[PDB]
UniProtKB/Swiss-Prot annotation, chain A:
Species the sequence originates in: Severe acute respiratory syndrome coronavirus 2
Domain of life according to the entry: Viruses
Name of protein: Non-structural protein 8
Phylogenetic lineage: Viruses, Riboviria, Orthornavirae, Pisuviricota, Pisoniviricetes
Role description: Plays a role in viral RNA synthesis. Forms a hexadecamer with nsp7 (8 subunits of each) that may participate in viral replication by acting as a primase. Alternatively, may synthesize substantially longer products than oligonucleotide primers. Interacts with ribosome signal recognition particle RNA (SRP). Together with NSP9, suppress protein integration into the cell membrane, thereby disrupting host immune defenses.
Included stretch of the parent chain: 4026 to 4133 of 7096
Compartment(s) of residence: Host cytoplasm, Host perinuclear region; Host cytoplasm; Host endoplasmic reticulum
Assembly mode: Interacts with nsp7, nsp13 and nsp12 to form the replication-transcription complex (RTC): nsp12, nsp7, two subunits of nsp8, and up to two subunits of nsp13. Eight copies of nsp7 and eight copies of nsp8 assemble to form a heterohexadecamer dsRNA-encircling ring structure.
UniProtKB/Swiss-Prot annotation, chain D:
Native source species: Severe acute respiratory syndrome coronavirus 2 (2019-nCoV)
Segment forming the signal sequence: none
Subcellular location: Host cytoplasm, Host perinuclear region; Host cytoplasm; Host endoplasmic reticulum
Quaternary state and interactors: Interacts with nsp8 and nsp12 to form the replication-transcription complex (RTC): nsp12, nsp7, two subunits of nsp8, and up to two subunits of nsp13. Eight copies of nsp7 and eight copies of nsp8 assemble to form a heterohexadecamer dsRNA-encircling ring structure.
Domain RdRp Nsp7 cofactor residue range list: 1-65
Function: Plays a role in viral RNA synthesis. Forms a hexadecamer with nsp8 (8 subunits of each) that may participate in viral replication by acting as a primase. Alternatively, may synthesize substantially longer products than oligonucleotide primers.
Protein known as: Non-structural protein 7
Region of the whole protein represented: 3860 to 3924 of 7096
Domain of life: Viruses
Amino acid sequence: TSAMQTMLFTMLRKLDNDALNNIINNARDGCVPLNIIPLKLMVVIPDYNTYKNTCDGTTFTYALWEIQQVVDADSKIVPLIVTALRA
Amino acid sequence: DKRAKVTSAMQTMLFTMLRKLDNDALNNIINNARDGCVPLNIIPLTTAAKLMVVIPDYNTYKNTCDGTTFTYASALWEIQQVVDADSKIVQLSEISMDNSPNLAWPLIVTALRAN
Amino acid sequence: VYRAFDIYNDKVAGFAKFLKLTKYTMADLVYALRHFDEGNCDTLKEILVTYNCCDDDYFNKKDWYDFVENPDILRVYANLGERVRQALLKTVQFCDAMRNAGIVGVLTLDNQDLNGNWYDFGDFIQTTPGSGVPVVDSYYSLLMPILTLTRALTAESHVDTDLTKPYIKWDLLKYDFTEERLKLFDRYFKYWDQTYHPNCVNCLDDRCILHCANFNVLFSTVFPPTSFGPLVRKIFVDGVPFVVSTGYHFRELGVVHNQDVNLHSSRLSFKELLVYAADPAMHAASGNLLLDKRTTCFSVAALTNNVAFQTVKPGNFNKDFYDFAVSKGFFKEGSSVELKHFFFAQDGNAAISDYDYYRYNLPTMCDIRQLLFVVEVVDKYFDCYDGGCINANQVIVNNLDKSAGFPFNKWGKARLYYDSMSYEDQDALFAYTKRNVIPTITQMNLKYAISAKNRARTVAGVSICSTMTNRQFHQKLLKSIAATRGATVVIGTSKFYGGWHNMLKTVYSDVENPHLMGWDYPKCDRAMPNMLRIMASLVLARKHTTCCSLSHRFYRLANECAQVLSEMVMCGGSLYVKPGGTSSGDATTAYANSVFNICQAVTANVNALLSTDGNKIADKYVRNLQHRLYECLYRNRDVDTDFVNEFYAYLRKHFSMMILSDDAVVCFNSTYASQGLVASIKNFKSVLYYQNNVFMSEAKCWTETDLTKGPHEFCSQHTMLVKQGDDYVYLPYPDPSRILGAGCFVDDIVKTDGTLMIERFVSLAIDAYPLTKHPNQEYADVFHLYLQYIRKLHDELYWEPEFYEAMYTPH
Amino acid sequence: SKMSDVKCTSVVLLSVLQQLRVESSSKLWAQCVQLHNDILLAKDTTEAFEKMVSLLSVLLSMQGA
Ligand SMILES: [Zn+2]
Ligand SMILES: [Zn+2]
């Protein structure tokens, strides 16, 4: 059952584009999104290290989406869920 | 005993369609004909006691079944058990002009025949 | 000025558009709707605009003319149907107005403006008043095609036939409408000097059957659609009542009554259980009323408390062969050989769109006299085979594991059903079908195979009794037809062994300036009308001369029409009504397609030879041929064998066809087609538009002026002229992109075991061996890759090339 | 070799996605099949990779095994 995912991941690593490997590295570090990227993007920030490496103030480099929605994990404004649109 | 197998299968199918079948209103609709010879397209139209409407989008829910009781086949029908496209039960208090994009289409409106 | 004329004398025969109250006439309208050409169709535009059917900006829209893309062009045509009905009601207020005067003459189309009044009383002869007769055969014969293309009847069906009045509440329990049919006839077609029968049981020969079915369809396009369908009564067995069908009410053959009906029975044997389970009555009665708002057809849908949603899975990509191909340096940048054939997934909304594609289907009235002469010609085309009824010991049934239809599929496929019943039971069922109607319901599934386009393909599985009886009849007829070599229809001949070469040589025969041509029919199975399907079945039953009387053949035709043409389909978890168009379940639908194709071709030739003006024809033998063609079409009611033989010989000499179902190759004499005396392609376009209700776009019909390169494409194969040991022979080679696609994507039947994988690979290499001899090197490298891959597969467990060479040598 | 590999990855990714029964949501599976069929019809080099990253976000937004 694993072999299909192994082949998928080896083909994806062979593809060698920027956005694919970026998203793979984010997800292996833990930074996964929570919905479909619109061609509105929701992302769960695991730790402050990924916030520092990816979010610069309000500018956010991800594949780039300019992000101002900050509340919390706990659904009270201050993990962190941030949703943005393509600018 | 495979011939008899499908024989008994069809026979039990016939008997279970028969136990769901015999009413008196169908007998009255037959006895209001000339010689009892009647089309087929009007047996469930005027005999069966439950209507199913599948509604693809919101504008036809708005133009067909707006309310609790709706009108079809010159009779009044009483709604129950509105179901989305995923066989999960939906309360009638959700189907709105703004909340429609958030719920899976189409929808299954199951009604019972109101006298 | 240019105008369409319908003239006939000793000098000139045929409806011709040359140069000589409304601006335009009924003949012009029928010509513009019957001889359509989108390059030069200004007359149709002017007709549609001048009387407020729609606006010029609607024509300024792209594809204003089509029936398939943007199917809202019927809205207008319906307003012209209203005009047609108004002008057709003045044809009975003039005939009975001149008959009294006592005038013998012919009525032509070209004497009547679009309102309906007449002129030019120049040709008639005067006789004693009260004893006249007009000749109005050609009039209605040519006016027929636009009496269901525009309908007029949705306009007619009002409480006193005024368009400003509500719809009639007809009685819901009345079903026969025979008196209303006769009243419609005597109001609209009073002077049609042949007997019309409201039911088709009362007709005399198959030609009368066609005539009465055409009139029945035109008269039945105005009745409540909740009425056509099985007729049921209440029957009792061992005390408990049933609701089973004791008749049927077509649009085509009026009301038909079973003659073997058993009221107050006591027991049901195997055949009775089979027929009663096949009945839609028990299923439509035991179920809930449904209103499905997705589709525009009628719908009585039960059998479940919820709809089923079925999806189509994606393909299985094979990595080993693709890795081998990329190691062989394929799919490099800037190449002509790449992957383009894929497995597309689907939702079920795809199934609903497929049923809407079934919605792309109208009621058609076709012409009648040209239909009867085309049917005589097509019978002459089929005059070299042998038919007849056979017993149950003379059917050879192949591939016994197809779908056994609904609701029979719940306990097995057709194999169990055929090994259950003895021969005598099947003969008794057949003999019962010879006097009875068994309406039937078909299962519909989605098809799972290669395509180049995103759309979903579907397939239909028909019940066991209908296929069993079509099997007896057309097992005999098709085994007679397909075991021949060198005929017009090429079905069941292997292209191998020089077979394609012999086929092409027979296509050449002795034609003078051979040019090649081909076509395809847009939306074949969805738009094929009812008239032509009945006509094909009638031909296949006209091959019955010695076994059946009139009654048996009529009951067989009724059974065929009620089981294939207009039955109800189980689509998902619903029962809908299927308006028309063929089913994909038997081989006699590929042969109905063949007959349909031949019909289309013959009709095209007839139009091209009769709509051309003989005064510019320099020959006089073809001029006399055209004169006799007009005579045999619009004159004699009897059948004339000599002229039919003459015209069949003319076609076989000047128009050589190579026919497979829906896919044809035409070899024709070029100078004649330049003069128009054999079928061009614009004639086919016009015929398809006016008689099949699709528009055949010009980008899919091709023309090849050099014969030494063969058919551009036929049966999904390309051909090249190669030399093989001091012989120049034609070889078929495929599109190799399809071969690569079938190699890289397989569908998980072969993803388990390797033997069937090697079978598929060797078959693919056989279909694509001849690619070696094409000038390009890449195709031979494709063949070499396939050979190397089959070699590698054989080693890790037909491998030498010669095995595939001998596949294409005619030895 | 940069236009075929993307289609092969799209096909295998949609097969994996189906093998985790996302078809039990209408909207999500409809979006997935739409993106898949739009990839398998692409004749340009650029937007195919956008749709590929969108489908990989679809995969890695739900808790993949
Ligand atoms: Zn008749
Ligand atoms: Zn016979």
